[PDB]
Amino acid sequence: VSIKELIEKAKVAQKKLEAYSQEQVDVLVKALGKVVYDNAEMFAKEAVEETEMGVYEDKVAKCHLKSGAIWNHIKDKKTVGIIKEEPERALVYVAKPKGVVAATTPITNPVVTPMCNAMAAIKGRNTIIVAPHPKAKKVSAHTVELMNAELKKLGAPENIIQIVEAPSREAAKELMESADVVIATGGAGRVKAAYSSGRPAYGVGPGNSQVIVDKGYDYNKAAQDIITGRKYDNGIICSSEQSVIAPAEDYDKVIAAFVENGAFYVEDEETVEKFRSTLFKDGKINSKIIGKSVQIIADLAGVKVPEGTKVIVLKGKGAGEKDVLCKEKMCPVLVALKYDTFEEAVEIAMANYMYEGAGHTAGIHSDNDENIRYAGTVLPISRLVVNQPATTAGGSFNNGFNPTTTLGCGSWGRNSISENLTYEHLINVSRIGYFNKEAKVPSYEEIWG
Amino acid sequence: VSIKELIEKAKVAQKKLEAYSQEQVDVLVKALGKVVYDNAEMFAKEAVEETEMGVYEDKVAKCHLKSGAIWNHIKDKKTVGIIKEEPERALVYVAKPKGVVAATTPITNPVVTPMCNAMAAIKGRNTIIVAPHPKAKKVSAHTVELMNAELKKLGAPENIIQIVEAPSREAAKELMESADVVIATGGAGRVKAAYSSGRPAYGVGPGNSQVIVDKGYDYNKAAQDIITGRKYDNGIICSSEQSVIAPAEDYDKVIAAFVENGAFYVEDEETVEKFRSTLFKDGKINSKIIGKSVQIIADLAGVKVPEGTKVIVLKGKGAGEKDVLCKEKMCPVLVALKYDTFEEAVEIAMANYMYEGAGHTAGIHSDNDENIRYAGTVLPISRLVVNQPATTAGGSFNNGFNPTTTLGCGSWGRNSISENLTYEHLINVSRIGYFNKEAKVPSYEEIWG
Ligand SMILES: NC(=O)c1ccc[n+]([C@@H]2O[C@H](COP(=O)([O-])OP(=O)(O)OC[C@H]3O[C@@H](n4cnc5c(N)ncnc54)[C@H](OP(=O)(O)O)[C@@H]3O)[C@@H](O)[C@H]2O)c1
Ligand SMILES: NC(=O)c1ccc[n+]([C@@H]2O[C@H](COP(=O)([O-])OP(=O)(O)OC[C@H]3O[C@@H](n4cnc5c(N)ncnc54)[C@H](OP(=O)(O)O)[C@@H]3O)[C@@H](O)[C@H]2O)c1
Numbered sequence: 001v002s003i004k005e006l007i008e009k010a011k012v013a014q015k016k017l018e019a020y021s022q023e024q025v026d027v028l029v030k031a032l033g034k035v036v037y038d039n040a041e042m043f044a045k046e047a048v049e050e051t052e053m054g055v056y057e058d059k060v061a062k063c064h065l066k067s068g069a070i071w072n073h074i075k076d077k078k079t080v081g082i083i084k085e086e087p088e089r090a091l092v093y094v095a096k097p098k099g100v101v102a103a104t105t106p107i108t109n110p111v112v113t114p115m116c117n118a119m120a121a122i123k124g125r126n127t128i129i130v131a132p133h134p135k136a137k138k139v140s141a142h143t144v145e146l147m148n149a150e151l152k153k154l155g156a157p158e159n160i161i162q163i164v165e166a167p168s169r170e171a172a173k174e175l176m177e178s179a180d181v182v183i184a185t186g187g188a189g190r191v192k193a194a195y196s197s198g199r200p201a202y203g204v205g206p207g208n209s210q211v212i213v214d215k216g217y218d219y220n221k222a223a224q225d226i227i228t229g230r231k232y233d234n235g236i237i238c239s240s241e242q243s244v245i246a247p248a249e250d251y252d253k254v255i256a257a258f259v260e261n262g263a264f265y266v267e268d269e270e271t272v273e274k275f276r277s278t279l280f281k282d283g284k285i286n287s288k289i290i291g292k293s294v295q296i297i298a299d300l301a302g303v304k305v306p307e308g309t310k311v312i313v314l315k316g317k318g319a320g321e322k323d324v325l326c327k328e329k330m331c332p333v334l335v336a337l338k339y340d341t342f343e344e345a346v347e348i349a350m351a352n353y354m355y356e357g358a359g360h361t362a363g364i365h366s367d368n369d370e371n372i373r374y375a376g377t378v379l380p381i382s383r384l385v386v387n388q389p390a391t392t393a394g395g396s397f398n399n400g401f402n403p404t405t406t407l408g409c410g411s412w413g414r415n416s417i418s419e420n421l422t423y424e425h426l427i428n429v430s431r432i433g434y435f436n437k438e439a440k441v442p443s444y445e446e447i448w449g
Numbered sequence: 450v451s452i453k454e455l456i457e458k459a460k461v462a463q464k465k466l467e468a469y470s471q472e473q474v475d476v477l478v479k480a481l482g483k484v485v486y487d488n489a490e491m492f493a494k495e496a497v498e499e500t501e502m503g504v505y506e507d508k509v510a511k512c513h514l515k516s517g518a519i520w521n522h523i524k525d526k527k528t529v530g531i532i533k534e535e536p537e538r539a540l541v542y543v544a545k546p547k548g549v550v551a552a553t554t555p556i557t558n559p560v561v562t563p564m565c566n567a568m569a570a571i572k573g574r575n576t577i578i579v580a581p582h583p584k585a586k587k588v589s590a591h592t593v594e595l596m597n598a599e600l601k602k603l604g605a606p607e608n609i610i611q612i613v614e615a616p617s618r619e620a621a622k623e624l625m626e627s628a629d630v631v632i633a634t635g636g637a638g639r640v641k642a643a644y645s646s647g648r649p650a651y652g653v654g655p656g657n658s659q660v661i662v663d664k665g666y667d668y669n670k671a672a673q674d675i676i677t678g679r680k681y682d683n684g685i686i687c688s689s690e691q692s693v694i695a696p697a698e699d700y701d702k703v704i705a706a707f708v709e710n711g712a713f714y715v716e717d718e719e720t721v722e723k724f725r726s727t728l729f730k731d732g733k734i735n736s737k738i739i740g741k742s743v744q745i746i747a748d749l750a751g752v753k754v755p756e757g758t759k760v761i762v763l764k765g766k767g768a769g770e771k772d773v774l775c776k777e778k779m780c781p782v783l784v785a786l787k788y789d790t791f792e793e794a795v796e797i798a799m800a801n802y803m804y805e806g807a808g809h810t811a812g813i814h815s816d817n818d819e820n821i822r823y824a825g826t827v828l829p830i831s832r833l834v835v836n837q838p839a840t841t842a843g844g845s846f847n848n849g850f851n852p853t854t855t856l857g858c859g860s861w862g863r864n865s866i867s868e869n870l871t872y873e874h875l876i877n878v879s880r881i882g883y884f885n886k887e888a889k890v891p892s893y894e895e896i897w898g
């Protein structure tokens with residue numbers, strides 16, 4: 001049960017797996033996703049119970065969506081041997097595994113993340129060792145167990161998926177340093193560790209999705225989408241909506257649309273502070289309300305919130321560090337802010353990203369494509385989600401984001417990529433470079449002219 | 450000036466630089482390359498004198514080629530703002546700077562590497578802080594100085610390029626940890642510290658280019674290309690040819706082609722050992738002969754080598770660890786080995802990559818594309834250079850490799866990329882994801898069928 005034994009088992013498995021063809025890894029990869037789809041109800045109930053956060057019905061939808069969207073995305077992708085011919089540059093591209101993947105998986109998505117990481121790794125003839133969050137180790141282990149059971153029935157090499165029980169940080173550090181490539185999906189601490197391991201690493205960053213509602217947009221649809229995303233899994237998703245940046249001239253109209261769709265809006269300064277003092281203790285999120293219901297938060301705050309309320313919306317004191325409510329809230333609570341111009345809406349969003357979450361996701365609800373493009377152009381984000389719930393940032397059958405459970409945050413979030421992690425990031429792509437003799441020696445004028 | 454003050458001045462510069470348009474960074478980038486082109490003769494002379502390695506004429510050609518090939522490649526690349534529209538996936542792509550680049554530069558390419566890194570950085574609206582090798586600090590600083598003079602003439606903001614005047618230790622470590630993104634072009638130690646800094650890094654592993662001469666190929670042309678690559682800058686290029694894996698049935702022919710083209714071939718065991726004991730001390734390369742002439746090496750070995758000899762070729766005792774000569778040699782010396790079958794030739798090259806240089810470059814000289822494709826599929830290399838000097842792996846006007854002075858070695862070499870570093874690796878590419886309404890919710894059979 002030592003790390004060095006797990007690494008050694010993984011190398012032996014990887015060599016066996018490296019002999020697989022494209023079609024043969026595709027069989028295993030499809031089965032890994034389908035077992036999470038087929039057992040979504042059992043996994044979802046186990047996750048909610050063990051991690052003490054989230055919503056059963058949303059984790060069922062998450063398992064259904066992630067497994068099917070990832071497989072549908074990667075089923076026709078060429079990741080074995082020669083994958084591309086490019087005669088115009090006299091190049092031939094070859095896909096080769098990176099080897100053994102070390103993957104640290106979060107408490108918020110303890111089922112789909114080992115599944116996603118395993119599917120991406122095995123798709124490129126890599127093997128993987130999962131190290132789960134301690135508060136989710138059982139359901140993560142159970143996911144690995146049922147994945148390994150389907151691999152055995154298909155004749156897969158033993159131990160292409162392993163999992164460590166003890167989250168001993170001496171053993172977790174040793175695992176990242178001993179593996180060929182590291183995936184860290186979790187908090188800022190586990191991400192910095194991956195990028196200090198001396199090995200090529202793919203991490204994530206804390207989210208803090210800012211949302212601009214543009215003037216004249218259908219506020220009813222905007223409110224429905226923002227509420228759908230904020231309340232999903234009790235708000236623990238990294239892409240979840242965190243703020244409502246609304247136009248001053250239509251502010252009451254926007255709030256009314258949220259109220260019409262299940263929000264409880266708090267304007268009174270003293271009543272907001274009752275929530276604020278509950279959600280944050282000494283500037284840090286109160287772990288007791290992470291992924292909890294609206295009513296749990298209301299009772300701890302001592303505020304009566306109507307039955308049926310889907311999200312709480314709190315009027316904020318101001319953008320950025322003017323209000324701790326502008327930090328990431330892993331619960332169904334939004335902070336509302338006003339703007340006079342779209343430029344001010346962007347600056348408010350940017351101030352909150354500088355506070356927390358730079359490089360992740362933003363949402364926008366607008367019929368003004370020039371404003372959308374300006375926001376995409378200037379905001380410190382990897383993903384801008386337009387006119388849909390921001391939780392679709394990780395993939396949906398109605399947008400073009402690459403399906404994943406590991407959302408890169410770029411240099412802002414101190415990650416290596418500013419995009420969703422896929423199979424592509426776990427294979428080396430070699431180049432065979434031929435000689436093009438029918439090419440002349442360009443002169444000084446041709447180069448510098 | 451302290452690193453903390455360098456980082457601050459750089460961040461101020463980048464904010465001013467972020468407002469630049471595509472055309473405005475292009476003017477700066479071009480002038481950076483052209484000032485190294487126009488001063489190639491002066492820089493080459495200073496580099497040979499200060500670093501006490503290399504060849505003046507080769508450094509002039511290096512400066513001329515790298516500067517012109519990089520500009521010619523990146524002149525028309527879109528790296529600012531919205532760079533691509535993909536309506537089939539309802540996506541729009543946005544290029545954004547990563548911020549402040551920390552770039553450590555090597556003793557072997559002290560002029561072109563600061564140039565190439567600065568061009569790639571500023572092309573994506575980044576700023577850069579160069580940490581040169583101590584044995585090349587003067588000429589690297591001189592390169593930065595003349596580059597900054599061309600920037601000022603064009604009206605660029607102050608300090609978009611800076612250089613650390615001090616060497617390593619806490620300063621270089623603090624720089625890599627404090628910057629947004631790190632480039633490490635150098636030895637295994639600098640690559641390791643880059644991937645341990647807690648920041649996204651790009652490294653370059655040690656090279657050890659294995660070369661297979663295939664049966665029936667024009668051995669005269671192969672010898673000319675291999676000698677050209679091996680002798681360039683006295684053998685200090687990381688892509689430089691290091692071995693001659695030749696068919697046993699034609700071995701004397703191949704050697705004869707080498708001798709005909711300026712090689713001195715040593716078959717006698719005791720005479721080879723005179724060279725071997727000079728080139729390697731205790732299994733490590735003798736730093737006194739790094740980038741030195743054939744005659745300096747011959748004099749130290751006490752072996753008479755004819756005047757005009759271009760390279761020395763030593764018959765190796767065997768593949769891999771059977772001979773220290775199979776390691777990387779940063780000097781104009783090759784190790785010769787025999788093979789009975791092409792499959793065995795690949796195995797020999799494989800064993801030498803396991804000894805040193807896995808993930809870098811190989812060369813092959815062949816008209817049999819099946820053999821070329823087999824070698825490129827089996828070998829742990831990011832680049833396979835066909836029928837040309839292996840030193841063209843960093844780019845040439847006659848192949849498709851992206852021009853660079855920073856050649857990543859993939860996961861094999863403990864790097865994040867298995868390709869040549871370009872502007873692309875220094876921008877965050879973001880995605881605007883619109884909502885596609887026409888798509889319908891897929892059924893189970895439509896997902897898993
Ligand atoms: N971008 C994405 O794709 C994505 C996916 C999931 C979550 N996230 C983000 O990550 C955060 C959630 O991560 P989490 O929900 O896993 O909780 P967490 O934020 O990782 O914090 C977990 C707590 O337990 C510690 N901890 C974490 N992993 C541990 C381990 N293996 N062994 C021992 N202690 C450990 C952490 O300390 P350290 O500081 O030492 O970790 C921290 O105190 C949210 O901010 C969310 O937005 C992002
Ligand atoms: N793939 C590429 O694009 C590329 C480009 C250039 C060079 N290379 C590879 O790099 C190797 C040569 O690199 P080099 O010629 O620059 O010498 P080096 O091997 O990078 O370092 C040489 C010696 O200098 C020491 N050193 C002391 N202070 C240093 C400092 N401030 N920065 C760096 N090293 C310092 C190093 O210690 P540490 O152990 O702490 O480094 C090492 O012992 C060759 O193997 C070559 O193939 C690859």
